[PDB]
């Protein structure tokens, strides 16, 4: 399997209601393993998966120091962004950042990421070469100039190719029982009349990990992309995920429809039909 580590930072200002909130969460694939919340009674980097708990005091102290320093940096960045966009001090704004590394099945670095947003829109991104930037507008070009002058990309490149990959590999070994286990979907097809001459077929996938899945309906072997209702993949709360796909079909034509399921936990793709 290919594997990734990602951190997600959110800093949200709230004029009149104190300093901006900073929350950081870290993931390996679809498994959260740490969190930090500046609004907690005692803000600390905290474990959120059982395999990270074995890390020692130096780990938790160092991560807490880093995330507290990041909270202060992003509070300043929100003030800076107000200047760059000529905005008043009256409104609430949000900075987001996601970064991390992807490994191939080899276990070697496939690519690194470090991307940031302001109020939900792209702001600046580290390019795939890990040495240049893509700025979304003339405000972000000001940041780009600063980061070029300060050699920020070189530092990020050193992290992404070095500690990021090293520590992801460590987590994958320590957590191998779960992080390196794919749970295939449990699948079934339900049937419910809409009316006398149409019925809904719904193809269900439950209990699977990781979240990536493809569920498709075919009629007479042709994909029904436009006529298929596909819900967002959703978490069950026990590490696994759920999804369904539905089509409305003419009564009497149900056996012309097949549901196809692809998932890493499956040796080969599954084909199912409604079984009356």
């Amino acid at each position: 399997g290919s594997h990734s580590m990602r951190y997600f930072y959110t800093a949200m200002s709230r004029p009149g209601r104190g300093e901006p909130r900073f929350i950081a969460v870290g993931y390996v694939d679809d498994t959260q393993f740490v969190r930090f919340d500046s609004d907690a009674a005692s803000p600390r980097t905290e474990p959120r998966a059982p395999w990270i708990e074995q890390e020692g005091p130096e780990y938790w102290d160092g991560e807490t120091r880093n995330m507290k320093a990041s909270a202060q940096t992003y509070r300043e960045n929100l003030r800076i962004a107000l200047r760059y966009y000529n905005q008043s001090e009256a409104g609430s704004h949000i900075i987001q950042r996601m970064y991390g590394c992807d490994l191939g099945p080899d276990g070697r670095l496939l690519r690194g990421h470090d991307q940031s947003a302001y109020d939900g829109k792209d702001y600046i991104a580290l390019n795939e070469d890990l040495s240049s930037w893509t700025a979304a507008d003339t405000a972000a070009q000001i940041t780009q100039r600063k980061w070029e002058a300060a050699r920020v990309a070189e530092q990020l490149r050193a992290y992404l190719e070095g500690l990021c990959v090293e520590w992801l590999r460590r987590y994958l070994e320590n957590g191998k029982e779960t992080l390196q286990r794919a749970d295939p979907p449990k699948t079934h097809v339900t049937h419910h009349p809409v009316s006398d001459h149409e019925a809904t077929l719904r193809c269900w996938a439950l209990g699977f990990y990781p979240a990536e899945i493809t569920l498709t309906w075919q009629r007479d072997g042709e994909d029904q992309t436009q006529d298929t209702e596909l819900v967002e993949t959703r978490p069950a709360g026990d590490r696994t995920f759920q999804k369904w796909a539905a089509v409305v079909v003419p009564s009497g034509e149900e056996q012309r429809y097949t549901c196809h399921v692809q998932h890493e936990g499956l040796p080969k793709p599954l084909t199912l039909r409604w079984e009356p």
Partner: peptide, 9 residues
């Protein structure tokens, strides 16, 4: 393990 790099805008 998180990134230590300071990213001031």
């Amino acid at each position: 393990l998180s990134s230590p790099v300071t990213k001031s805008w």
